[PDB]
Subunit: 221 residues, 5 copies
């Protein structure tokens, strides 16, 4: 069993741009179940170096959990077998204005500290010959979010991907997020948020389409 068509096209598009999250050739396909078990073991070791009575009934299953989380959960975006099934319909309606999906739930991790990134994404595109099923947008945002990320790069990966799938450069992405690596640690700023945006096609070149999008960005409820 091997990958999908849309998946391939995207992946290549990001590679051709140096936007792919830093990875090393898989070499051999290590039995996934065996991958966790090894990691879980490593976690055990760290927790011990922290003097954590594993004999207890609560922390006992954590080493396992953390492994299952990294392997089959918050980093799934790393594997393209998880790329969402994409579907498009003929732009019969001749939609020549932008379609915007705002306040998309975006959950991620800052690759620097492996800590929570809680945010919101706002995506918009102007249909060329295809209108994409709304959910696919969300699904595409959450795919790239589930990986060790750098907001700036995440935003970018979302753009090129939508552009590749929709068949248009007229796509704009915008992520607004709270970094817990900045919040629950270090400088510990509890109020600040980070906003990153990637503007394609007209959203970049057209001064009209640009400010139409940015103006409708950053909403609450």
């Amino acid at each position: 069993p091997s990958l999908s068509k849309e998946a391939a096209l995207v992946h290549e598009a990001l590679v051709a741009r140096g936007l792919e999250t830093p990875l090393r050739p898989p070499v051999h396909e290590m039995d996934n179940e065996t991958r966790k078990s090894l990691i879980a073991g490593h976690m055990t070791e760290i927790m011990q170096l922290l003097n954590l009575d594993l004999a207890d009934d609560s922390l006992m299953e954590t080493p396992h959990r953390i492994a299952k989380m990294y392997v089959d959960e918050i980093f799934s975006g790393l594997d393209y077998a998880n790329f969402p099934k994409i579907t498009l319909i003929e732009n019969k309606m001749k939609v020549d204005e932008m379609v915007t999906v705002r306040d998309i739930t975006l959950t991620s991790t800052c690759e620097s500290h492996f800590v929570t990134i809680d945010g919101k994404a706002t995506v918009a595109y102007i249909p060329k010959d295809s209108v994409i099923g709304l959910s696919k947008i969300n699904r595409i945002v959450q795919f790239f979010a589930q990986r060790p990320q750098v907001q700036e790069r995440l935003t970018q990966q979302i753009l090129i991907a939508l552009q590749t799938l929709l068949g248009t450069n007229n796509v704009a992405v915008s992520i607004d997020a709270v970094h817990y690596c900045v919040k629950a640690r270090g400088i510990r700023d509890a109020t600040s948020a980070t906003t990153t945006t990637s503007l394609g096609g007209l959203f970049k070149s057209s001064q009209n389409t640009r400010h139409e999008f940015l103006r409708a960005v950053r909403h609450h409820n």
Copy 2:
């Protein structure tokens, strides 16, 4: 009795653009009640295939209710007999400025999943010779909304129809909505909302008027 003048003008205009909901020739006028029974029955089979005790006094009816729902309420926009009675008045006031009606209660269904689309439409037009009855706008929005829809298309319909009835291309239609095929299902995003817009004449050609509309779009209470 056949139909209505406006209804026909509109149906035609939409067909001449390919904006009519993908319909098949009704062929023979099957008795309306005959359909609800058939559908009601089909629903019975469905529920039974879901192993549900139709014997129970509650589920017992449902097939009929779901039947009556499809045919008579949420899809009544499919039959132009339910087209709203259109009424105009000479623009003796010589209103050359735009008239806007916001936060219009739009209830709809996604043709992809036959699920609730909960939205709010904003409509604007610049009076040429006539001024439409305000509630009529609300009523047209709801007409096309009451069909298995696609927001991108729904917006287009509300524009064309309104342009036709008013006699001006200067009509703008914006729709903020929550999709439950995105929220209460699949990806299960609880916070996102889709926004589509369709601009006519000036609302498109004149950068001035265009934004005067877009700046006034999206409001709460």
Copy 3:
């Protein structure tokens, strides 16, 4: 005694532009007492026609009240004897910028149904040689609001009237309202509202002045 210089020019200027309220020739001065009793006679008839019990000590005075409301209150704008005494001062301050009165309380009645129109109005003007008393801007708005109305014509009247008294076509009026003929019955839309605007002088010609005004709006219930 007859009327007032201002109420004259205003009414005159309104008929000239064909914006005045659709009134019939004068017929003959009917004693104000007479008209009220007369309307009550009809209200009594209408109530009996509804099967109410005017005997009831409560309803018993409604015919009399409704009459008083129509002639002495909610429609008193049809009578220019009610036109507010406009007072001004020389513009020795050389105020070449726009003055703005936002959120003016506007209570009106829709003529199509003789039902409550509840709104907020924003008025702005660039003082030429005279600076009008603030509350006057309020009264003038409420004068024309106490008439069976059409939001579109109402806005236009306010504009024309202020231009006449202020001596500048540089006035702007905007009205955001909820129509209970839309909300309380018929389509029964409980979330929508209508916004109408009339831009005069620079507020229309000067692209820059227009947005300064239009931008400063949206507040109410």
Copy 4:
């Protein structure tokens, strides 16, 4: 001319533009206290003319209070002797951008009725050679605010005054107030609000500048 270099420069600058509150030459300097006793006396007459029991313990000291309020309080801005002390600091950091001060408490009185005008001001300027202390703006507003007023003029006085003190035209004033002569009286509009503004220099000419201020005006 009155009693201060800054105060004098301003008062002269406003008189030179017909913006000074309509005042009649003082002539002789009757004792301040002497006026309160006279005012109080007149009010006493009014309260009597209004069939009010001054004999009662409360309304008894009200004439004096009202008299006091007029002379030493709500109309304090009339006497430039009360002008705030202005202090600026050399613009060594060269701030070629606008500095904005918003939601500046403003309490005045309509000269039409002598009733509460409750507002909020927003001032912005572009430092030329000097930068002013922040509280000074707040103070300059409230100075011209403590006079029987007309919002449209109040805004004009604020603007000029500042321009002078800062030695620049690039100043901007925007007042957003509620007039109780319109709320607890007359048409009695409990919701309305008046927003006057006075743009100068670049806030008047330069389209870009002009709107940078207006977009950031009106804030809760």
Copy 5:
């Protein structure tokens, strides 16, 4: 160990433009522990001049506290030894859009009164060749914040600092702050708040970019 490379460039950069906080070249040069004790000496004296009972088991440790606060806390920005360890990753993602960090906690003190300055800061920049770590921006802001400040000057320092550190003139800084030397005393304005902005590169020359920034400024939660 002298300072830090970036700490030095920045310092030098700030002295070149006369944006350094007015400081002297020590004359008598002494120990840090000695400095706190002398200040605490004076605080004790002031507190006695205020007839405060230093005997009270409470007020006793106050001079010593105020001493440690001025030397190791609220003014720690005066010593470049405290500068934040900056780190940048090569902008391989080629991010050519403005990354924005909003509502950054800013705790400062007014040099005119030694009273608290409570505000929020918004920083944005266009990544040229390198992408800085987010928290760092927060840090750079707070570094210049802990000094007897002038909001105007503080804004400029964050700007230059960031420009020099990121090696780009495309940086915009805006600070919204409440000065208790305005609020808690003197004129006592309980509602006012000063806003300052500093625009570099495209944020100044490019009107297009200049408004993208100024629009996404001043946010709540």
